[PDB]
Amino acid sequence: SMKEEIKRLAEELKEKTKNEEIKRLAEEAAELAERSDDPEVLEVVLKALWEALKSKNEEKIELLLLVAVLVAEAGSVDAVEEKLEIALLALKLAEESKDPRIIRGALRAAIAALRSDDPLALKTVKEALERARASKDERLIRAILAAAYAFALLAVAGASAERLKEAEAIVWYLIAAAEKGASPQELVLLVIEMMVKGMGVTMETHRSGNEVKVVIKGLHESQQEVLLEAVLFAAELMGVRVRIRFKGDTVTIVVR
Amino acid sequence: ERKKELAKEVIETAKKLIEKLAK
Amino acid sequence: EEAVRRRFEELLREALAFRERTGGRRETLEHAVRLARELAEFAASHPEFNRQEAVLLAIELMVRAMGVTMETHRSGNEVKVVIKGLNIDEQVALYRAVRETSKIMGVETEIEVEGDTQTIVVRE
């Protein structure tokens, strides 16, 4: 079968690269391909897998497998139009930029977005990708994608639709802040403030000595993981170094 | 209908980005 | 004590034989956290085994199933184990596992995440 080749080439790729990121993505792409009975999606997965085996840049294998996972989630049976729209924006935006951080950020944001069937969430990342498609400011593009991915992580977590409603305004402020020329340090803080507000918890951000120190109490275990994923990805995307220290459900972040 | 349009648009663009990342 | 260490090798040959073998669920990063929890649940059953030793054995049992490095420098009654070379999904699995094991062992630990490195301070 067309899925039989996908399983063979996917399992044959995990025994090649020694990056755990390649292992989880190639396996995830194959698993999504078994649901999709669309032969056109099975062709994109088979072409991306066969082209990723030949390439050995590893980071190119990442971006190639990212397209395989994204085009497979869109090929999921009974896919809403807006889902396919979000993917096209990310696929186009990845082709329209040379920074590998934008190609990864755009693809990963759309992948996490299609995970949740939340219509308020699908529109927040869709309008965000449209705005990044127009501007050429790389920092603005990365901030829009970092906010779209963090917003998607809140929706995948399954927070209240009211909580996501508040988080939407934080995304709008975040995209506007990068439009006004905000620093990369302060934009990450806006990403953090969207997480604490979208999960119904309180914060206590401090600031003294050219180093913002945001402490957050009340976060449960699962909430600290969703915070850690969004804050880390946004930190790597914006390009700033942060420290996320844990101690009895009191996360403390140090940006600089 | 338009879902069939965006269906082709996602599949074509995906195969175009794959070729761009390959070279 | 003598039985606590024996259970560690049974789980270490499970974490290594699972990370080595191709196929199966490549998403069994939870199986690593399962092995770390099975080790500390066992260690809690023997209340004479060192808590700090149980957490250190679970962190090591984790980094073997993930395939990363681990260095431990000891100061006073605290040991500082630093794990290096983690992606975002590994930063979350290692954090969740150390958070589980030190909780089911009833011992204070503090974590610090930064990029690809995760520093753990296991204190008695």
Residue numbers in the entry:
A (entry chain A): 1 to 256
B (entry chain C): 2 to 24
C (entry chain B): 1 to 124
Quote the paper.
Several natural systems exhibit ‘facilitated dissociation’, in which an effector (E) can bind to a target–host (TH) complex to form an excited ternary complex (THE)20–26 from which the target dissociates quickly. We set out to design protein systems that undergo facilitated dissociation. We use a switchable target binder (host) and a flexible effector that can rapidly bind to and switch the target–host complex to induce a large steric clash with the target, forming a strained excited ternary complex. We show here that by explicitly considering excited intermediate states when designing coupled protein systems, a broad range of facilitated dissociation systems can be designed.
We next sought to determine how the target–host–effector ternary complex deforms to resolve the designed clash. In structures from two different crystals, the switch region closely matches the state Y design model, and the rest of the structure strains to resolve the structural frustration from simultaneously binding the target and occupying state Y. This strain distributes across multiple locations in the structure: the binder fusion bends, the portion of the target that directly clashes with the switch becomes disordered and the target twists at its interface, disrupting the interfacial hydrophobic packing (top) and shearing the interfacial strand pairing (bottom). Double electron–electron resonance (DEER) spectroscopy and molecular dynamics (MD) simulations suggest that the ternary complex is dynamic, with varying amounts of strain at each location. We directly measured the rate constant of target dissociation from the strained ternary complex (koff,T:HE) by flowing pre-incubated host–effector complex at a high concentration to form the strained ternary complex with the target on the SPR surface, then tracking target–host dissociation under continued flow of the effector. In the full facilitated dissociation process, as the concentration of added effector increases, the rate constant of facilitated target dissociation approaches koff,T:HE, strongly suggesting that the ternary complex is an intermediate in the facilitated dissociation process (lower pathways).
